[PDB]
Design a protein around this ligand. Sequence first.
Ligand SMILES: C[C@@H]1CCCC(=C(c2ccc(O)cc2)c2ccc(O)cc2)C1
Ligand SMILES: C[C@@H]1CCCC(=C(c2ccc(O)cc2)c2ccc(O)cc2)C1
Lengths: 235, 236, 9, 10
Amino acid sequence: NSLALSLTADQMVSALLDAEPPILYSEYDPTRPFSEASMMGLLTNLADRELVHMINWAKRVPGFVDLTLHDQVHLLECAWLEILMIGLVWRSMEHPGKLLFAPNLLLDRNQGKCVEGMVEIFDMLLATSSRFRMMNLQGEEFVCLKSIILLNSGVYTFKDHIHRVLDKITDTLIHLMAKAGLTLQQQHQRLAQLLLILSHIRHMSNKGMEHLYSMKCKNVVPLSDLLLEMLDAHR
Amino acid sequence: SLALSLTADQMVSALLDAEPPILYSEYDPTRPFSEASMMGLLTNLADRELVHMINWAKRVPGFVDLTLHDQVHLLECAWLEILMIGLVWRSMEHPGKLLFAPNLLLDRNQGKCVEGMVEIFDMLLATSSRFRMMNLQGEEFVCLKSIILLNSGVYTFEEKDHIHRVLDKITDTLIHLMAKAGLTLQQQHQRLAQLLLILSHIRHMSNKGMEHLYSMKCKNVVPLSDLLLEMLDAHR
Amino acid sequence: KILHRLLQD
Amino acid sequence: KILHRLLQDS
Ligand SMILES: C[C@@H]1CCCC(=C(c2ccc(O)cc2)c2ccc(O)cc2)C1
Ligand SMILES: C[C@@H]1CCCC(=C(c2ccc(O)cc2)c2ccc(O)cc2)C1
């Protein structure tokens, strides 16, 4: 009772690639953002618009629609910042030392220093981006990883359906590596390497969430009602 | 190194021999339960476990080859994760209960005894129930624990490639065990993925736990040990 | 919650 | 540093 399980590996890849959200632009007419208000203002506005695309992206992830509405809510609530971050890290892959939040918004270490306790997440994000490029992460692998995050991150806060969809994404990841001519040993080693990254992406999300919670209490940057609800879902 | 030259079975053996003992609590079933003394028991327990963990870490293949400064960093990052996956492993055959010690088994309505700790309690139970359904093997457990030690702080620092080399060696070992158990090539990959996704949740539980411990220190009602305080400051 | 409404669309 | 100490002990 799920069309997701019946798909072939290529059907799975094709569905994920076509479900990809677009790369959104930040606000124009810029000063290079240097105030804690203007930078977080730009980022909050960007993340807010990205979330709308993510929600409709999630509905196009095979197996996600089979879940009850409440289960869909829980997964997105848990994983939304993880997904934004791995998206950010993926975009910043061809730009070492810099973070491409948007094509017209590239930030480095020095602008992270702007916000009190912000450069540490930056370094973690930059490190993850460097890690992706050294691994030569492919777009087909990236969309698999992102879907895994969506289905995995909130699975133990509730169920065989998700695990069987997760198993199939693994089948897809291996299928991609085998197609690229990787040996059997190179396949499971790379699979392990990719999945261990998710542990750090999870860590970056948790540290980021605490920071956003701090910004809410600071009440200097106005958060949208949507982000407030996504934020409140954690603590 | 000497870890890179190790075969899969040698790796398993060395890891199994390096296993720390299961320490006892000070729990007195007749004594009251302040729930600030429960945290006192757990704090005392964890503090003693840390001493065994540190010496356990020095027997993990590859770890000794690292600079002392990097050894410090990895343990500072992963100590609660390692304590937690140990707790989860001990509690595997006690459904709905957490085995902090042979004399200390706790369930849900004792986790709420501490402010905002019942959710962390339920997450640990979920992880334990997950290991049970997967029928996690002891050989697979010691591999996972070593992976956490090496991986959790590897992107927070050269010789990081040496860690990646050892990390790949443990992956080989994990696959070796699964092929040994008669699992097909598809099953090996799936189970391997399943196991490593658990680490993401153990990371999450650690972050949540680390926040609860910081809150407890600021309250200054349950005193943390000198070592535990330093490990806590590491995450800030 | 807003998230409810958006998932139904 | 305690962690420094125990790791270093020979
Ligand atoms: C502290 C976090 C780590 C760095 C990037 C951050 C955010 C972010 C992440 C990815 C992305 O594509 C767009 C935006 C962010 C900023 C503001 C907000 O209200 C919600 C999310 C913030
Ligand atoms: C909030 C955490 C939830 C799970 C259990 C926890 C602790 C714990 C974890 C594993 C273990 O073997 C022994 C003890 C703990 C308690 C007090 C302390 O100072 C440090 C660690 C606390």
